Amino acid sequence: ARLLDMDGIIVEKQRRLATLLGLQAPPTRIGLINDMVRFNVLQYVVPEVKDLYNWLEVEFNPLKLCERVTKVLNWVREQPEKEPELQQYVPQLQSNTILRLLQQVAQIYQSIEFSRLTSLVPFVDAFQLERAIVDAARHCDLQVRIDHTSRTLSFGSDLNYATREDAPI
Amino acid sequence: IMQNTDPHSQEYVEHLKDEAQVCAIIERVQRYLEEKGTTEEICRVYLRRILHTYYKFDYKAHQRQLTPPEGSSKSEQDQAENEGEDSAVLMERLCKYIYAKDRTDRIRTCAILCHIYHHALHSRWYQARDLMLMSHLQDNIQHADPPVQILYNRTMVQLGICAFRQGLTKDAHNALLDIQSSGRAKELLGQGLLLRSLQERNQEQEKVERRRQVPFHLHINLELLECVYLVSAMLLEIPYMAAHESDARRRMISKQFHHQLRVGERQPLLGPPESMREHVVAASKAMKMGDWKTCHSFIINEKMNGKVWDLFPEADKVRTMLVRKIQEESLRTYLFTYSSVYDSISMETLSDMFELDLPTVHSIISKMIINEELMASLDQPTQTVVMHRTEPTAQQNLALQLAEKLGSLVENNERVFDH
Amino acid sequence: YDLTTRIAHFLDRHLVFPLLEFLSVKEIYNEKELLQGKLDLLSDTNMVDFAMDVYKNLYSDDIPHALREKRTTVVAQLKQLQAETEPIVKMFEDPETTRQMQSTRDGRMLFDYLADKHGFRQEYLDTLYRYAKFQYECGNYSGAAEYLYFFRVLVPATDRNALSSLWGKLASEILMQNWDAAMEDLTRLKETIDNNSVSSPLQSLQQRTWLIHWSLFVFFNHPKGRDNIIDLFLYQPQYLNAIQTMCPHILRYLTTAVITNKDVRKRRQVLKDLVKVIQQESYTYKDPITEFVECLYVNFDFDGAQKKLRECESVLVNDFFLVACLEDFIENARLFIFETFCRIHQCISINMLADKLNMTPEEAERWIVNLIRNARLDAKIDSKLGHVVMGNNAVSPYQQVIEKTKSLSFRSQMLAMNI
User: Fold this and answer.
1) Which of C 255-284 lie inside 8 A of B, CB atoms?
2) Distances (CA, A) of B377 to A44, B145, B354
3) CA atoms lying within 13 Å on the CB side of residue B139
4) CB distance C392–B377 less than 8 Å?
5) B344, B357, B378: which to substitute to probe chain C, counting the most C Cβ within 10 Å?
6) Burial (CB count <10 Å: 0-12, 13-18, 19+), residue C361
7) Which residues of B touch C9 (CB under 8 A)?
8) In Å, how far is B96's CA from the nearest CA of chain C?
9) After which residues does chain C become discontinuous at a C–N distance over 2.5 Å?
10) CA distance C272 to C372
């Protein structure tokens, strides 16, 4: 909507929401987590989950991440004693981990065959995930030539250097 | 009667039954006719009879055709039924001359508006489109008195409806546009308050509308009319603005669905939609993102809410018409952004992904690269595109090139004024 | 349209002379034989085109109308019946009448010479009255009708006579195969209807049909006639509003007249205003060939297109109808589509092309090389494969504005700089 019209009339309202919540500005991200984990939070955390962010935030390594996180996923996705609140927040956060992985590999690789790329990433389906990459790519979070005649992907060393690759802000 | 009884509920049904019975009476008053014999004035019995044939339904224009015609009885009676569906559109052909014969604009402009109704609903929308385009009743309603103004508005509704039912975004837009420029369909159907904004004075004069207009069984839902208009425009304008914000902008037009979307767009606070407006806004956002998925939300759920879906036996058809258009124009909105990113395309992917087939995706991408004037080269036997159309910095460069170019053009007006 | 509010009342009650009838039970392709059964009535008995049918596929159903003409030659009809071995005993009335015509003639023939001799108006006009009387009794008396209307076409009751007489002449002279005399009426009949009488539809639309008649056959440059008729009663594929009228070959022959003799720029004007209009919506449901010719084309199909286009050309060569440009259509039906297909293309095979249209790849190659010679595409052949390559992606459109946007302002500031 913003990218279309100019342009808000759509920011001070967010500031107002922040005030409501008690904040003065706009929250941030897993930044937030750093925030509320400066406290004794690495500890109390129940260890269903203690060793799931020890992948996401802590552990490297793109070509193992979606593998590594599959088990703490299956753990938490049993919902009824762990607050069903959580397990609707999980599928987006799974895609957010994929989104994290997708951004890295543009700097790890300069090209990759789509058949290799399938095996790197444990996921439900390729036909789903490619469209979610092309979505992210279309929304300028990475640059990829995932669609291509051979069905192979090219990240490219620079080509034309832009903040499309970098995720822009 | 059918005015002072009220409304959603019920004395109502024995009254509907008196209505049945007066149907009876008017039928009766028809076959008899020694008049002076047959033809030559009776026509007004016929008029009454067509006033009680005209606002009836797909189901009774297709009890002849889709209550199975080889599963139905073959008994003279069944032919009198199949002819009964003909017998009103018959009296058109007949009783034109029995009026045919009066030139009085106030009955001519009245009658033909009821005739154009029959066509689009019972049969071809072609014949409906033909009949008003021949007649040219835009001039003639000026000569006509204020009931027939209401008929003119009323007929325009059902044609923008059967535009959307035949599946044509364009004609449904232009048809339902003229109503949706205004908020007077209220007062035109005799429903308006004196104050419902500030405008609608005076007391003793709006009562004329209450006395003249209108039975409850002739109405239509305005949220239907609204949504049907806002959805027609949607498929036209979301590729259009996708194109625009890929810097094809100079074609940006106010006081249109652009505006009607804008007022709903600028809500800071929308989560799930719970209004028909918001379901249109909801499907609109899905169309921008270019996921088919988001179209289906409003097309299923809000049409059950809302019973936009549940008023047509042709919603079955109009589903398919909506769906494949969404899948094609969402592909197009996707392409308007993504085509900088491409080096090439497996066209086979697009067919699989947007749930389309190669013969059509050929014809689509073919039409697209011709008329949207893209810098794609298109291998149609190999099912490959090779594009390589740059640049992301172009979004700034073409923009300041425009900002520049706009300088000299207004400046020549400032010259030509001056001299 | 504006005449169509008036055509709406009449409901197809036109004034054909054989009344309805042509050849009965028929066996061959049908959208062909459509136009023959049409123009049988609309042309006042055709003649040659009785037998034009019977050549390819024998009938004895040409014989009923072969009883019923007298102005072509009485006795020519009196033989074709005898040839079919029919007893026809009582032919005692045409020998009675057309004998006594000669007794009548010896007056007018005498009076005629003596009047044009003297140069004396009165003796010529009383002759013209006696003689314009006479020539519609039998117009065989072939050259006599031409002689009659050589000096004076203004008879006692000018237009009504003149119309039916010049039409009787345009009819009979095409049947006599005296296409110089028919070309004389090509000047005069069309002028008479452009000097329209009442302008009632039954008159006007029949007269509009009679324009389609002289343009049908082909003597000289009837594509000039095309450019003249299309700018009369403007831009309609029938000229006849209300969708009853169906003439396939008016548009096929127009398509031939556009492409084979002129540029095709100039054919997308046609593709809008003759291939999409209200009359033509009806038509698009019907005719196979002319549908394939344009709908496939404009959709930018190539596979079904150039196949079903090539399939049309089997039905074309079955045409014994008067056309005389039948093969230049067959030519251009392959040319026109190819240019448009290859317009945005990457790489087409000469081999795939040659498999389709059933030519050898060499032919297809020199064909393509001649399409590029003619500069209807900018392309280049990958000779090794026998594939042909278009590949313009033409990036950097920035510079197009930059020269002129300052060269305008530089020389336009000179204005205000002067004084």
Assistant:
1) 278, 281-282
2) 60, 60, 22
3) 6
4) yes
5) B378
6) middle
7) 96, 100
8) 8
9) none
10) 27
Backbone region of residue B130 per phi and psi (left: phi > 0; alpha: psi in -120 to 50; beta: other values) = alpha
Q: How far is CA C138 from the centre of its chain?
A: 28
B window 319-338, beta carbon within 8 A of A = 334, 337-338
Any A CB within 8 A of B342 CB: yes
Question: Strand, helix or coil at B160?
Answer: helix
The structure was resolved experimentally with cryo-EM
Say whether C300 and B96 touch across the interface (CB within 8 A).
no
The residue of chain C nearest to residue B410, with distances taken between CA atoms, is C409
What is the Cα–Cα distance from B214 to B146, expressed in whole angstroms?
14
Residue C275 in contact with residue C294, Cβ under 8 Å? yes
Is A160 within 8 Å of B392 when comparing Cβ atoms? yes
Side-chain-side CA neighbours of residue C318 (13 Å): 16
With contact defined as beta carbons under 8 Å apart, do C366 and B399 qualify?
no
Tell me if C270 sits within 8 A of C347, measured CB to CB. no
Do chain A and chain C touch with ≥3 beta carbon pairs under 8 Å? Answer: no
Stated resolution in angstroms? 3.6
Q: What is the DSSP letter of C345?
A: B
Distance from C-alpha of C282 to C-alpha of C290, rounded to nearest angstrom? 13
- Please classify residue C389 by burial: count the beta carbons closer than 10 Å to its beta carbon, then call 0-12 exposed, 13-18 middle and 19+ buried: middle
Q: Rounded distance, CA C295 to CA C284, Å?
A: 9
DSSP code, position C349: E
Element holding A105 (H helix, E strand): helix A84-108
> Measured between alpha carbons, how far is residue C289 from residues B214, C120, C284, C293 in Å?
51, 58, 10, 6
Question: From the list C2, C341, C408, which residue is nearest B136 (CB)?
Answer: C2
Strands B344-346 and A111-113, how do they pair? unpaired
Closest CB from B262, B334, B343 relative to A148 = B343
Q: Do C278 and B130 touch (CB under 8 A)?
A: yes
B34 is written with which tokens? 């020694």
Q: Are strands B344-346 and A152-154 parallel, antiparallel or unpaired?
A: unpaired
d(CA C282, CA C246): 9
Cα of A29 to nearest chain B Cα, Å: 20
